[PDB]
Design an enzyme around this catalytic site. Sequence first.
Site, PDB file in Angstrom:
ATOM      1  N   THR A 103       0.729   4.941   2.550  1.00  0.00           N
ATOM      2  CA  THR A 103       0.833   3.526   3.010  1.00  0.00           C
ATOM      3  C   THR A 103       0.894   2.585   1.813  1.00  0.00           C
ATOM      4  OG1 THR A 103      -0.365   3.939   5.090  1.00  0.00           O
ATOM      5  CG2 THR A 103      -0.300   1.644   4.293  1.00  0.00           C
ATOM      6  N   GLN A 104       1.914   1.732   1.789  1.00  0.00           N
ATOM      7  CA  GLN A 104       2.048   0.709   0.757  1.00  0.00           C
ATOM      8  C   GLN A 104       2.393  -0.629   1.405  1.00  0.00           C
ATOM      9  OE1 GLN A 104       4.553   2.510   1.842  1.00  0.00           O
ATOM     10  NE2 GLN A 104       5.712   3.514   0.196  1.00  0.00           N
TER      11      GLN A 104
END
Lengths: 196, 196, 222, 125, 226, 233, 204, 212, 195, 195
Positions: free
Chosen positions: F1-2
């Site tokens: 996740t970014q």
Amino acid sequence: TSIMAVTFKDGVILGADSRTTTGAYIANRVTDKLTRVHDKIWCCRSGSAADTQAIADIVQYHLELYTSQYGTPSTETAASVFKELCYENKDNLTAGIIVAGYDDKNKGEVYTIPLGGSVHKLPYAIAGSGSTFIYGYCDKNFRENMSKEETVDFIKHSLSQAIKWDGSSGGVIRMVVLTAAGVERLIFYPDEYEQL
Amino acid sequence: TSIMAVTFKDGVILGADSRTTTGAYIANRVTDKLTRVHDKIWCCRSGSAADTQAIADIVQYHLELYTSQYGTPSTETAASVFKELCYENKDNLTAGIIVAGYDDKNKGEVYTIPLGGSVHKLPYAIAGSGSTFIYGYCDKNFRENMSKEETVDFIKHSLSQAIKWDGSSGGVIRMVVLTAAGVERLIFYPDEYEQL
Amino acid sequence: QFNPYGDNGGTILGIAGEDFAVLAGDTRNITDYSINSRYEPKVFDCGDNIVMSANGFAADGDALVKRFKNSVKWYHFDHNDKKLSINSAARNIQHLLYGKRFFPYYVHTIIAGLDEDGKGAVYSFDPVGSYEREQCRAGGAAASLIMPFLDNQVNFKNQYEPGTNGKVKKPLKYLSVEEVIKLVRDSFTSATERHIQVGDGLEILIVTKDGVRKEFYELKRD
Amino acid sequence: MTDRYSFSLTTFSPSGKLGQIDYALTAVKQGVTSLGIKATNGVVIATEKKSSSPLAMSETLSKVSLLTPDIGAVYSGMGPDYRVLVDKSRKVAHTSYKRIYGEYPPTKLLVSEVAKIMQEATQSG
Amino acid sequence: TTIVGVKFNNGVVIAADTRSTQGPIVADKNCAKLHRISPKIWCAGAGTAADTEAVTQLIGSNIELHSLYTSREPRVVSALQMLKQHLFKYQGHIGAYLIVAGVDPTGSHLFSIHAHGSTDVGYYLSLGSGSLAAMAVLESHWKQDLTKEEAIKLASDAIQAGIWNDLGSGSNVDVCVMEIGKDAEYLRNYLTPNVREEKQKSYKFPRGTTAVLKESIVNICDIQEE
Amino acid sequence: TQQPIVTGTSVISMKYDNGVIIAADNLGSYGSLLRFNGVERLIPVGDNTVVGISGDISDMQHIERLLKDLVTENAYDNPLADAEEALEPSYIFEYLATVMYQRRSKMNPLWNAIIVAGVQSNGDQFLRYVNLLGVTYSSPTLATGFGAHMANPLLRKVVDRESDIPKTTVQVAEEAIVNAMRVLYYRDARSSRNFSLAIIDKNTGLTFKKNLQVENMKWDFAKDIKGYGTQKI
Amino acid sequence: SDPSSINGGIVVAMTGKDCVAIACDLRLGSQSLGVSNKFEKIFHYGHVFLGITGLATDVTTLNEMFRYKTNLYKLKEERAIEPETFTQLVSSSLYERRFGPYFVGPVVAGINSKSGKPFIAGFDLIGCIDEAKDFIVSGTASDQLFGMCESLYEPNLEPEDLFETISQALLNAADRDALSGWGAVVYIIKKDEVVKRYLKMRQD
Amino acid sequence: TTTLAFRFQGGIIVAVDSRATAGNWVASQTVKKVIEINPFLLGTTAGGAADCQFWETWLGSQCRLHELREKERISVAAASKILSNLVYQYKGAGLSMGTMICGYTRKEGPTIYYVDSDGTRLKGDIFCVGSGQTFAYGVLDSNYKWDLSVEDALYLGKRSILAAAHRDAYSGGSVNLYHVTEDGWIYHGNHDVGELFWKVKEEEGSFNNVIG
Amino acid sequence: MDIILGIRVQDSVILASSKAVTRGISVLKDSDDKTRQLSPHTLMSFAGEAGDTVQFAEYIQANIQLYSIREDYELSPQAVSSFVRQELAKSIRSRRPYQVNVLIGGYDKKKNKPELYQIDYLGTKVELPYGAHGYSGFYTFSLLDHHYRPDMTTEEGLDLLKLCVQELEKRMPMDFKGVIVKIVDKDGIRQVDDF
Amino acid sequence: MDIILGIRVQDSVILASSKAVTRGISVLKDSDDKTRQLSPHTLMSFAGEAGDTVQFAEYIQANIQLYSIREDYELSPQAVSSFVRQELAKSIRSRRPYQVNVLIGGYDKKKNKPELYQIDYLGTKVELPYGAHGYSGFYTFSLLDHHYRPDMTTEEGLDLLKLCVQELEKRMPMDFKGVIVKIVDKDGIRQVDDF
Ligand SMILES: [Mg+2]
Ligand SMILES: [Mg+2]
Ligand SMILES: [Mg+2]
Ligand SMILES: [Mg+2]
Ligand SMILES: [Mg+2]
């Protein structure tokens, strides 16, 4: 932080302020943000000091091992190694790096690597918290194929304004000149650049 | 938003872009952010459109009632009424207003009123999201007692750069000139200012 | 925060006849208030006289259908080109779904075909693999609009024989393929009127002993 | 300041008369004649435009007033009292009826509201 | 919802779709979104449907009383000012997003109003969930000095873009034309491009299908004489 | 996740009688800052495919390298690499679609919306979409981000269904695309005037147009607009 | 937690040829627990009928409120309120509680005594009027009712045919909703006679 | 959901409802909540439908492998413990299960084990699981005796589900009956609650509150 | 508090209410009477949040007693239940709502009929043959559904009530320390001292 | 589960453990034996989270039974308690800790002495004359502090235990459905079937 790199006729010049803050306290007022990864490939560091020092040290190691095997690396190659580290470890890094170098074949080149880990080859680049305040000035005043004296004035005037408005920036203006002639360090003190 | 007001020899000129956004959608590309609170006292609006319209309308009411009783108000008086509303209701307002006016006695005057509700009398003022990118340019290029043509060029070039870098700013550059001669509206289109 | 799931809308309907089975679904594909495609096939022929649809999050839907089609292919390799019966296919799909019990395929799966006695069959699955043979099953966005109508018009629920007044139920007479298709079309026409995510087109796959046949019908595009 | 007249100015006299109401009716008697006639398919109301001066524009002074699209009013007596009653009658047709039922009030009920306002000025402080 | 307003030569036109929704469910397939503030001042509403209806009736009521008080025909700027000051007071909690258009002695006008109390001026405007689809059409085909016939065409085409491409909009197109020196003409269901096709089957039941427990006559009449 | 950092906005596209058109502006935004003005977001693969990418630019550059690497790999031990066994649009898309869905399934997505436009061996038009969730779909017109809301409505007026594709010429299709790009420049706050346009035709092949600009803009009417309601001057 | 689905229940209304019909289930519950099978949700004030779904305390409160208001209306107007007028009253009354609303889904049904025109209307909890020609639905099985009504309904049905349509619409919708059922009532309304019928249905 | 199972003279009665809901929406009225593990063993489904289906079907496979290896019928104790040990490994992961593992062997006699996704494993005579369990318990507790006949025991299980089906909103549809003997289970049909309610009301005189 | 039951038989209403009063960790009392006589032929039991229960019950009692004196007349159970409902319906939108559930058992002397009304804290009123609040109904309603008849005697009602309490004592985790039972009929209100 | 008590008298250890098993809203069982025989002269009662309790107890049982077979020798209660403590101390820093509290009552045949060990889920071991887990001690310890003597007989210990249970039944809100009592002495382990 206020950092920039500008290409010109004879090569490229890196410029930076010297302020490092912990909140509003200036932890170091004489920081050297212009760091050497190879003889004529340097970089400007912004973001986490721990991260950008760690990255730069790894790059310097990679280019040293590259040189032992394949001879002098290109500025593009150096930028690629920076990118690879920044992109693959984007979740755990806060680093904004400008890479600048001088080849004889390619001459002066500038690559900027923002938070994401993308790469952008540019005639000149600006970065750091103080850069926001000089996008207008730099865009209006930059010309290609400037002389050494003109480029030094452009960087000095640009960072002078960035320092003036950005509390996170300040101290001395450090510069490093990369040409065929060699590597020249320059320093400019508050009494000089504030009156500009 | 990119807004500014600049005093010069003959009086004062207000300048503004015309972009109003809801997130990334441009809700209005031909907004008029230069608004009239008295014959020769105008203002530039930034922040919440609902708040700045509500404030401006109340100020216009106050200065209209002032004029009925005590004759023409000073630019300082207008700025004070703006301040009083912004300061006393600071918890429920998101307004950044620049007040500009022309007296015959005082000539051109500019007052800026940022979020807090403080007042600052200045030779010129810049504000809005796009102003960040032209602090360097405006500081280097502003002179006192400029001519009308010089001041129009200064504002045009300044807002051109602000528009170039700020996605929240754009459209046409509107300007309003306040002098003894009267009130003159100016407009400058993308094809004109983008090539500068 | 990254959300790995999404809602692509759509509505599907499986009905089991006496010696046939239909699996229908609208061809509209959406996100939020936008239309991605007015024609994006949702019901698929998977071979061995089995039709399948995995409605909900289209990426998981496509992944599951792809994996099941693959399972049919390898069933042939490993077991001397044996025909995968609808009941065997159903149990296989349970294991595919339950395999991701703790990171589910966000879909409501329906398959249709014929059982080993040649009778019409429909199987219905929840996202994590609980399943059951059923006579009638609507899935997706407008499922709540369609099922009560089917209870009434297919199973004759709440319908009694005139004159008796609640004493004798309406007899459960068998419906023909032509009769089922009428109910399917009227179900989707009604769903299109009252559900925003339903529309554009209706694609029906009919399964008989002769094979799989397709029929397409226009729906309102608003 | 403050309105310190919180008591009735209209009161019963020994004979059972409410003086101020009788005197108000006397003021109405002095007023210019106005009339109303009801037909099978309509109603008519009329009055004289007694112009106070020939330089005055009598068109600007409206003795006959629209209260609702289907209701009109005319008066005899003190003009200023009429003008404010019309304003109140127009508003009360909205506040106590149209904003509730989405339609204009019937004649008898609007009359009832106007009557109530006039009754209160006969008893209030 | 898709609502638009378009200025033209001698007046202004507003238009709207006719779909009202409860989440993904269509509550009313032929909703009336064009509201009357005064005879020649009309507006279209998006957002919270009760708020749009309520706020236009309130301002429309006060506008009528104001018109009677001043012996003047109501102005659009008055409706605009009263609407925005009301909405601003309630700080966006009254979820009314309006396009206000009309003609008055001053001329023809077109404004938009947002729930927080901000207003905008324009020659062409669009609001609602289908506003982007509608604005795409307006930006592609709008020009200065439009005729009455061209403005109706443009406005309805902009609503159609919303009807077809926005799931929150659908059914029919309503239009209202307000020209200077004329009565405003409200064109209810100006276009009807979404009639439902005939069903495959009739679902009329045989009488006596439903099971019944008790029957009785309900007394709706009053208490009787004698 | 970014989270995405440097981003690219709308990619728009449509089918016409002999092929496909795809377009995307040359901007790399940094939030509200219009940081990079010379970013090419249309990346050709061979002479029969153009992949248009929006969203995170660092991930775009990664995808750009995967496609470059794909061409190299296809040429290995392949005498028909420039003929019968050349890369098809369908091969390129399915590869990307696999990667996108795999990456979302590891909770580490490539933060992009991608449109693969091209022409197949048999002359068939190829136009399909894929994004960070691995969601895929095809349509006569496809657009990402703001394009989906503003471009599609305009492009769908030209090609409203499959039967309209043979009736649509390259001149009409290009005209519609260019107009849509103007509309996006008016209304998308994260767009630029400069853009690139690519045409993939079954007869004339791949035509790649750089340094295009939005022109014929309407702004003159702005002079008449004054205040926000009551103001006359 | 959600006030509009604690007690459960449904109301549906339909128009026919010179007639209207309104119907409701009889369930009152506390979420999963069934509490009463005699909780009628349809009321009438003169010849105007009002169905109310949602939070039961508010159903009761609003019925008492509209009885109150229509009684005073009648005394002052000297006539019974009409469906069109009552609809506006319901809307006004709900909107005056804009920021503290009754959690209900009202449904008006009736025939105008002067014009003889059949009339139905629906409202959201906050007063927005839905004046449909065909049918109005409300309650915890409103989706189900929308589906049933959309397919089963056809215009200009005779009273005894309309009864079958609305009854089947209600029954089959309630059987697909956990919080609806436990009996049902149907009102068939003509200009000067009203028939009330209790339906036999499954009690689970 | 309402599921019960109780031990008695003639073996075990198992009774379940048939309703499946997603919130207020009734997804199905024809759901099978008795898993036929094998011809001798039964399991009830409450909580997670997939979890119960999958793992009790899996349990049947383990029981088959046991009797192949050991040449002997698996005990109800051993069968139930295979399931409880399995779900205990998954404890914390979010399995949702409440089941009765029912069987009749030589060495044990009729046996019921309540097995839980928390790892609980309880032997007992009467068990009720589901949203309508409290309603079923009342009818069971007041009418239960060890010396019930197979006919009366079947009716008691049927009537107890009906009690829950009536009051519990998330229970209903139809009643499935099973009778477990030493020689295997015997299915005793599907009984629609709608028809059963009126039938029971009239014949028994119960539910006077309801109008029929 | 915990469990309150009610059952309307042929000629009377029977209310059963638990005796336990717990404060977290300890049971402070095992003889608490959770009821108030509103009028000679109307009894109200109650359960809910601490303090609010008794405060509400006594407030209602005072108001009905006031009405009785003013008019020299006893309000019908229906009238009393409607008054109570309105107070609770008023309460739910207040600054701090009464968290109180009640059963109102009364004998209407005019109609010669027993009446049982169930009202929760929201103001949700229902007239029932038998009723409960909280979880009490979950255990008892299946027994009441089965055995209840409208023509039951008072003695039969008490037997059915004992069966309900026995089921509660078996399956409820909490020890509610038994119940106080009261009967409301034409002769008034009396307590069954042995249960 | 809920209440587990222990008391070491002159020549034996007595463990009392509740019979109730409540899973939420209903009491599923009222005859549950919350104990396992680890060896002929060592008994362990237990209370804590569902599943973990029995899983842990049986795991300990198997390990002690394994040791008994390997060495043909019964471990001392002290040795068994130390082994159990270490398992719980190991458990508390695990991925998912055993939520189990235990009492270990044993008779040491070498020393001819009864021994009671109290160990909580953290691995907190204490040797005591009498002990409890959870809230049980809050109600019972004041009685045990008062009456307990180290030279008590088994019959006197049972009487003091009855007094403790009576106080629990009076002041605890939860119905724990009585207790199963077991005695550990030189002759082994036996259950008191009437209590
Ligand atoms: Mg811009
Ligand atoms: Mg505000
Ligand atoms: Mg139901
Ligand atoms: Mg039920
Ligand atoms: Mg209640």
